[PDB]
């Protein structure tokens, strides 16, 4: 079902964080990586829809990063999706909805 082989912790980031940017939040992982090479990507709010590129993911390592300080009063949550595709061009997981909460 939806979980598949995803391993993801809850994601929260304090607003007004100190640099240096970009900052690593969590390392998104799919255990389909035990069967072959997997490539990670993210879509949605703060990734490929406005504000674009607030969150980025490192394709091979799964490191989810934040590129700039956040402001809770401006955007308090971001609804992103993580994707995992094999080296033979196929999705190895169903995309996972990740809610990033901006805290104090």
């Amino acid at each position: 079902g939806p979980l598949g082989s995803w391993v993801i912790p809850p994601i929260s980031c304090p607003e007004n964080e100190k640099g240096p940017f970009p900052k690593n939040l969590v390392q998104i992982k799919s255990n389909k990586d035990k069967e072959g090479k997997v490539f990670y990507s993210i879509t949605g709010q703060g990734a490929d829809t406005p504000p674009v590129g607030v969150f980025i993911i490192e394709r091979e390592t799964g490191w989810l990063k934040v590129t700039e300080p956040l402001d809770r009063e401006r955007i308090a949550t971001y609804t992103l999706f993580s994707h995992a595709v094999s080296s033979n061009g196929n999705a190895v997981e169903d995309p996972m909805e990740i809610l990033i909460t901006v805290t104090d």
């Binding site: 939806p2 979980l3 391993v7 240096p20 940017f21 674009v52 590129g53 490191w63 590129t67």
Partner: protein, 460 residues
């Protein structure tokens, strides 16, 4: 650079995206509307990020600019900034910038963000001595000798070919450093950075962490993806609250035993068979122990503050030590030898439960875990106690859903068949083993999976 007569905005700012932005900044309704130098003098900050800008020609007239954000654009040439000496902060990450020579005379700069560009040569940064924040990661920098005199730096990153860290020696005001993904092995210079609070050094070639010994102000340390084995040095770092040692070759966790301020500890993908040293780390909320050689996890029983726990890819038969971890919200133990999940009934606030590739035959202990949103029960396997071979041999099916009802087999080997509750075969002669599979979608709370597996029945 000064406007001596009312001039159209589109003739000052030649980039069509920047002209459009400036029209709005300047309160105009057409990019051809004229402006004066006093109109341009009102602009002290400029947030022009995410607009598809290729050229900043025209910024040179914004004589009162102190702060700019041109991040997430398509900038190459930054020559227009050369004489904007009032600039104290520049945000220009995510562009195609190679030549930063135009920044050399912006000596009032205190913050400069340039990560994710095409920068090789950082020699122009030598005269920016007032910098306290400098971000250069995701570039192709190999030499940081230009940073040697930036003695007021507090926050720094760089990349991705910097193997020689010696130029950091006199940067004693450094508090937060990220040297990840630089193929760095020698971190000896870091011993000099006695005010360091956060060191991120993932995906390098580090095997010797003895230089960290005197960095007792460290509260955050990430050495994920190195070649660490001996971590004895870390016993000195008693202020650590967040430690990542995943993807190394670590076996001896004794050095971690006294690090009682740890709230997040990542140890996945190591060579750990003994977690007794972790028993006193009671402030832990996140613990990652996946991809080790664990069997015994009884030391985890006192870690009552755990909300996130990974144990996947171990050799664990007894999951019961997690029963006292009542705050658990996400638990992952795919690829272990767990048959008895009775103890998980105690994890009433579990949301994510990943238990595939275990030896689970009966889901009834999970029935009341109604706060589950994500579930995994695929690919279980076990071997039944042997029975006697007979030509018309039958065994009871023992695969039970969350409801308590038996799950009918999906496949049965050697042409066998099923009618509840017995699986019966018709074998020609003696055979040492038969088998069957099951595959049944199931939802507990809101979490959905396929409870599936392969059951082997030896015949004596």
């Amino acid at each position: 650079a000064t406007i001596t007569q009312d001039t159209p905005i589109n003739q000052i700012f030649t980039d069509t995206a920047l002209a459009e932005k400036m029209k709005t900044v300047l309160g105009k309704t057409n990019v051809t509307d004229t402006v004066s130098q006093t109109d341009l003098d009102q602009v002290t900050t400029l947030q022009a990020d995410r607009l598809g800008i290729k050229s900043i020609d025209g910024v040179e007239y914004l004589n009162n600019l102190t702060q700019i954000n041109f991040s997430n654009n398509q900038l190459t040439d930054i020559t227009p900034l050369k004489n904007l000496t009032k600039l104290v902060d520049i945000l220009m990450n995510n562009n195609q910038i190679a030549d930063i020579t135009p920044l050399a005379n912006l000596t009032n700069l205190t913050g400069l963000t340039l990560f994710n560009n095409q920068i090789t040569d950082i020699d122009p940064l030598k005269n920016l001595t007032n910098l306290n924040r400098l971000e250069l990661s995701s570039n192709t920098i190999s030499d940081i000798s230009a940073l040697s005199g930036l003695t007021s730096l507090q926050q720094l990153n760089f990349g991705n070919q910097v193997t020689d860290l010696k130029p950091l020696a006199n940067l004693t005001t450094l508090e937060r450093l990220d040297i990840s993904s630089n193929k760095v092995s020698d971190i000896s210079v870091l011993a000099k950075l006695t005010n360091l609070e956060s060191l991120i050094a993932t995906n390098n070639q580090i095997s010797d962490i003895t230089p960290l010994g005197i960095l007792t102000n460290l509260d955050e340390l990430s050495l994920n993806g190195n070649q660490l084995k001996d971590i004895g040095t870390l016993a000195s770092l008693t202020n650590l609250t967040d430690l990542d040692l995943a993807n190394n070759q670590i076996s001896n966790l004794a050095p971690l035993s006294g690090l009682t301020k740890l709230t997040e500890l990542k140890l996945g993908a190591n060579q750990i068979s003994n977690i007794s040293p972790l028993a006193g780390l009671t402030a832990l909320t996140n613990l990652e122990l996946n991809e080790n050689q664990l069997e015994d996890i009884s030391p985890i029983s006192n870690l009552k503050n755990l909300t996130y726990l990974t144990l996947y890819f171990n050799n664990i038969s007894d999951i019961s030590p997690v029963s006292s971890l009542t705050k658990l919200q996400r638990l992952f133990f795919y690829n272990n030898k767990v048959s008895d999940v009775s103890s998980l009934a105690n994890l009433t606030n579990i949301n994510w439960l990943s238990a595939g590739h275990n030896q689970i035959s009966d889901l009834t202990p999970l029935a009341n875990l109604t706060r589950i949103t994500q579930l995994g029960l695929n690919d279980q396997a076990w071997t039944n106690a042997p029975v006697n071979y007979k030509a018309n041999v039958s065994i009871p099916n023992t695969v039970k859903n969350v409801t308590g009802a038996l799950i009918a087999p999906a496949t049965i080997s050697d042409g066998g068949s099923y009618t509840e509750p017995d699986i019966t075969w018709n074998l020609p002669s003696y055979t040492n083993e038969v088998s069957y599979t099951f595959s049944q979608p199931v939802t507990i709370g809101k979490g959905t999976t396929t409870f599936s597996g392969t059951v082997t029945q030896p015949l004596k």
